[model samples]
Target: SLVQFETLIMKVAKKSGMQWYSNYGCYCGWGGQGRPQDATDRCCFVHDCCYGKVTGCDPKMDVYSFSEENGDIVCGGDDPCKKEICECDRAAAICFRDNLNTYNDKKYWAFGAKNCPQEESEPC
Candidate 1:
């Protein structure tokens, strides 16, 4: 699933000549370097807000995962925060699909979120 998302993100970016501002927030997750980029970005912004509804789950802990042959892109886990944390990610993914467009006026990618280069992140 993530494999497909990366491809989509890259394809969109290449055509638009834009990219992620290169950090958290602005596009997806919390602690954004700036405000949300678009409707898809707003999904993660809302997702970040959703995560805050629960406790012990640093919204940052919510990550994306996919199985080469057995799963779809999933967020968070059935861990301490579980349900709520991951649930929000689902909404963001939905937001991504609902707002699909290769239009970018920024610099890098990911409609959801990722970490700093040293910490980690995903998609194009």
Candidate 2:
């Protein structure tokens, strides 16, 4: 899982005395196409901004999605910055889903749940 993976990396970074940025991340969730965007919508762009605000980092990332041929957002090739942020976000989303309704439970569902650490900013 992402938490386990991140925890492992965090441990290694701590032990190595490396300056690591734990906040580097992004998330993509349900956009709720016909509905007004909300926390539950998990709008990808909104989650991206939230991550930036919380981490005070760039938080630029790409969301792997269906292409126009499939009638959804299109896909592109490699983007280094996007790749980096997406990696962290993907891990965070996994952790968020895993913690739902448990001790680590959060307010919002989807990407916003874990990406935005501050509950106040998170939408319901």
Candidate 3:
């Protein structure tokens, strides 16, 4: 029930979520796009970073169960990278809520992503 609020916002913001970040954007599946679309995506940028080296972290992994409370998140128990993951979600979620309007604007995607342009191959 607690996460329902977040999930609802997420669902309503699917277009926003689809906006994703260029390199990691707000996703782990099918990868992300241009760059931080807003303060919301910016938070996700850091979340993915804290997630690990490489972008293979799975959000569905049941190694831990996390929840948010009183405008903050609480992660109990200890499990190495698990703690960081929870914290990452926490911050990302909070930013997402705080910047919901920015997401709805749908203007952040108009720029920045063009340069990356999901096509072609180059030596990096």
Candidate 4:
């Protein structure tokens, strides 16, 4: 499932000192047919973005995402580059997810909570 895959991602991120990006994660969440073009779902992309923004890193640059099929981290992937300021490798993105998406109480705490971090407040 996408959630499981995303959970795996969070675990990786935590271990890679990439928690700052966890607030803005992405997923292939139910997109197709009549689905929302970019639904937040359980991907936590928004959370990671918020985390980065609050921490002072504009998500428009430093954050990265994994393809639904390729599983590669395309640096400078953002085509527009209008807002984000940094580029990241797809592998690095996955690594970050692996660090954060672990099986633990803290993870569950983060998962269960609804209110996301304040722009860039450090996550537990």
Predicted model with the maximum TM-score? 3
TM-score of candidate 2 relative to the true fold:
0.27
**Which structure is stronger by lDDT: 1 or 2?**
1
Hey, what RMSD does candidate 3 come out at? 6.5
Tens-digit lDDT track of model 1 for 25-45: 454533453455566556656
**Lowest summed-lDDT stretch of 10 residues in model 2?**
15-24
What digit string (tens of lDDT, one per residue) describes model 4 on residues 1-124? 2233343345444332223333232222111111111222233343333334444444433444433445443333444341232232233335445544332333332232233334433332
Q: Report lDDT (Cα) of residue 3, candidate 2.
A: 36
Tens digit of per-residue lDDT, candidate 2, span 22-87: 212222332222221232123334444445543323543324321234532233336554444545
Ranking by lDDT: 3, 1, 2, 4
Residue 45 of model 4, lDDT score: 41
* Cα displacement (Å) at residue 99, model 3: 1.2
Each prediction's whole-model lDDT (CA): 0.46, 0.34, 0.47, 0.33
The alpha-carbon RMSD values of the candidates against the true structure, listed in the order shown, are 10.0, 15.3, 6.5, 12.4
Q: Which ten residues in a row have the lowest lDDT in candidate 1?
A: 13-22
* Residue 45 lDDT (model 3): 56
Question: Per-residue CA lDDT of candidate 3, range 1-124, in tens?
Answer: 2243244336434333433532333332234444454565566555556554424344446344555567445765566465555556555556666766655335444344454455521212
- Using all chains and alpha carbons, the TM-scores for the candidates as numbered come to 0.44, 0.27, 0.52, 0.24
Candidate 2, lDDT over the whole model: 0.34
